[PDB]
């Protein structure tokens, strides 16, 4: 019976909550209060990347830690050289509503998508001197929010409908379909070992999936509103999310619980991007109030503030070698901090 | 200073910048509009007529271009999206105006349309954005009111005490009852609109049919008093 199934689900959820409560004996703050604080951090802008016509929604780093890719609502993708502020490529798109981009780990392809429900893959290294579409992937019903590369032939996408999918590039057909969400999915992050990934949805819940088997492993429910950002700890055993309730949270997979919450009484606006440092000591978060904060990931205090944008901050990223961070906003400017 | 191979990467960047400047010049001369409404409302006929007169399985957005008096206009509508709207409406916070088409011959789904209009009008990201609302399907309203098969007072009790405003100007000249009914519907929408306007954006009402050829002119006029208002604000005059 449906009522019997609902009662069984409620009882099992109560059992899971009881197990989670039992497994907790100490808090992270209590353990970490005997550690010297990092202190004030002074990050200064080094370069400014101008040239975009409209607001910036997405940005991703390259593996070489020197190249950049950014997406704007005017319908263009620009590849930057961060050291010299030169423009290497300028790819015009068929659809002007793009809100995701990604660089392949090899450096040969890029991806983009948005309100057109299509994930487009571009080829950068051809005998001809131009950049051309390699394949357009179709099959999603709603808008696409995120996309990440596993290798040169596999991609992962999250869409407006409650569904994430894993694709093949040689043949455009899907391979696995991840279902179980209730609202729109807006964030996606792969593990360092490229065997698991996490997704944040509008139902105030986060899930972890396995690529090979294709089933949901664990679920996390601590937030009170939509989740807009997600990221992985470098270890691969924790992840941090940002939401519209002006709070950040840190979870752990082995314990399956929540460790700390990063909140302040002055901040009212919600977060839009979350990114870790190379060692995991600092968490960088963008906010709707035109400023980006820097938090200590172990003691939950505001280490520093970055304020250089005249509009809301949309994207944020940290390079592989940890020498710089990049921030894009709705003022159509990209900034490299150090 | 710089090596040879590197003073040939600057030239390429300069060429890219020139192309970007040309694209910016083209971009600044186009006005973008978003078409929004229910499935019952006949926005599809409106867009088909606009495409015919002037100027792919699960695609989520459609684009239509039309030109009037040597100015360009882009119109977008959402085809494959879900029922939720609070997420992708953020991308349309810089459009010139939003066109809201509502059917006027239903008497049963009018409250849903009014609730949708309040959701749109009070959106946080949709402030300082004007709305042009089209009250489509006037012929059906006139025929239904004349026939008298179904009444309107049952759905809206306050219709009995309502009276025709003195500013009503029926251009063709028809029966008073249909005029009273349509002006009552317009007054409901206008009360909703000006409840909390705050002076940052306006609402332009119109009575129209799907086959009418003068829709482009109405859109052009509304976009001109919206651009004029923004230029008034920007150039330190008010």
């Amino acid at each position, epitope marked *: 019976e449906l009522d019997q199934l609902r009662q069984e689900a409620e009882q099992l959820k109560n059992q899971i909550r009881d197990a989670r409560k039992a497994c907790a004996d100490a808090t992270l703050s209590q353990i970490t209060n005997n550690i010297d604080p990092v202190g004030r951090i002074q990050m200064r802008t080094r370069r400014t990347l101008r040239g975009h016509l409209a607001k910036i929604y997405a940005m991703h780093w390259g593996t070489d830690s020197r190249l950049l890719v950014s997406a704007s609502q005017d319908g263009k993708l620009i590849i930057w050289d961060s050291y010299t502020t*030169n423009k290497v490529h300028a790819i015009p798109l068929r659809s002007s509503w793009v809100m995701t981009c990604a660089y392949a780990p090899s450096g040969n392809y890029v991806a983009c998508g948005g309100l057109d429900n299509i994930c487009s893959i571009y080829n950068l290294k051809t*005998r001809e001197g131009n950049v051309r579409v390699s394949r357009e992937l179709a099959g999603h019903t709603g808008y696409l929010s995120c996309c990440r590369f596993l290798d040169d032939n596999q991609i992962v996408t999250s869409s407006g409908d409650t569904t994430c999918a894993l694709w093949d590039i040689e043949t455009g057909q899907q391979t696995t379909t991840f279902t179980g969400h209730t609202g729109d999915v807006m964030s996606l992050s792969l593990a360092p070992d490229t065997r698991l990934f996490v997704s944040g949805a509008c139902d105030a819940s986060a899930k972890l999936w396995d690529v090979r088997e294709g089933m949901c492993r664990q679920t996390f429910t601590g937030h009170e509103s939509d989740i807009n950002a997600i990221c992985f700890f470098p270890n691969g055993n924790a992840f941090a999310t940002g939401s519209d309730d002006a709070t950040c949270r840190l979870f752990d997979l082995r314990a399956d619980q929540e460790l700390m919450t990063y909140s302040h009484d002055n901040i009212i606006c919600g977060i839009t991007s979350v990114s870790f440092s190379k060692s995991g000591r600092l968490l960088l978060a963008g906010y709707d109030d035109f400023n980006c904060n820097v938090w200590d990931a172990l003691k939950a205090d505001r280490a520093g503030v970055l304020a250089g944008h005249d509009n809301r901050v949309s994207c944020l990223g940290v390079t592989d070698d940890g020498m710089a961070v990049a921030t894009g906003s709705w003022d159509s400017f990209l900034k490299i901090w150090n | 200073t710089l090596s040879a191979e590197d003073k*040939a990467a600057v030239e390429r960047s300069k060429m890219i910048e020139k192309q970007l400047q040309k694209d910016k010049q083209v971009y600044r001369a186009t006005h973008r509009l978003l078409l929004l409404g229910a499935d019952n409302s006949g926005k599809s006929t409106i867009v088909k007529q606009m495409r015919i007169y002037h100027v792919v399985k699960t695609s989520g957005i459609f684009e239509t271009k039309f030109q009037v008096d040597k100015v360009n206009f882009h119109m977008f509508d959402v085809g494959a999206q879900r029922d939720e709207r609070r997420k992708w409406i953020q991308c349309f916070n810089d459009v010139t105006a939003i066109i809201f088409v509502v059917d006027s011959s239903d008497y049963n789904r009018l409250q849903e349309a009014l609730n949708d209009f309040k959701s749109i009008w009070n959106n946080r990201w949709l402030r300082t954005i004007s709305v042009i609302l089209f009250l489509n399907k006037q012929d059906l309203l006139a025929e239904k009111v004349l026939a008298g098969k179904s009444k309107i007072e049952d759905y809206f009790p306050e219709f009995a005490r309502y009276t025709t405003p003195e500013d009503a100007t029926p251009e063709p000249g028809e029966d008073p009852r249909v005029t009273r009914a349509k002006y009552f519907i317009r007054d409901e929408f206008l009360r909703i609109s000006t409840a909390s306007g705050d002076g940052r954006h306006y609402c332009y009402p119109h009575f129209t049919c799907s086959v009418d050829t003068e829709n482009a002119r109405r859109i052009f006029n509304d976009c001109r008093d919206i651009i004029q208002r923004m230029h008034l604000r920007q150039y330190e005059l008010l």
Partner: single-chain antibody
Amino acid sequence: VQLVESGGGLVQPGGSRKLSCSASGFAFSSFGMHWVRQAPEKGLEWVAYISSGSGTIYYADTVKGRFTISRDDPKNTLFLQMTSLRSEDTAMYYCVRSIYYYGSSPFDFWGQGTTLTVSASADIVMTQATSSVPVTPGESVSISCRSSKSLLHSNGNTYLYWFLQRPGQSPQLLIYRMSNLASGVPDRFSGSGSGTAFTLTISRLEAEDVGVYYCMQHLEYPLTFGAGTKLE
């Protein structure tokens, strides 16, 4: 991709000619073009260079006033106008494309070449070793190179290039910037250097590896090539 060129023949001294390079199969407007000439029994020497957008034009010290280079993107072809042809201009001229951005590989493709017969400063000098070196199927070679001035720059790039010319068609690129293998070349080839001394190594010789190996510098114009070594 392909590059077909024509316009060569016997010319009396004091005449003029117009060489053309017809391009088809790639985006011409985004590429730079060079003219390289080779004497009937000697090495290569750089002639001129046009840039994308025709912003920078360079000439060699020998043909600075006589020669003129031009392009026209819509017709997708390249011209080189020569005046006052002396007896030292007898050579086979080539048409080579080059692109320049972070990570690009210039001098990737070479044309067929056209023949031309005429009836009778402080530039970096690169020195090659003895022309010949007798070899056998199955063993390794250690072609060497030398330079007058160090080719390392503040950026960290060493601008040295390697070319192979079979007894047949035009030369093909092997190594660019002293460490990178070009697309289409096997993994046997490898290059190394130390700023003024450079070398090229082939791990296992084959039947198609015979020919003449050349070098280049791209630190500053004009580009000097070197004599070259032959493997028999």
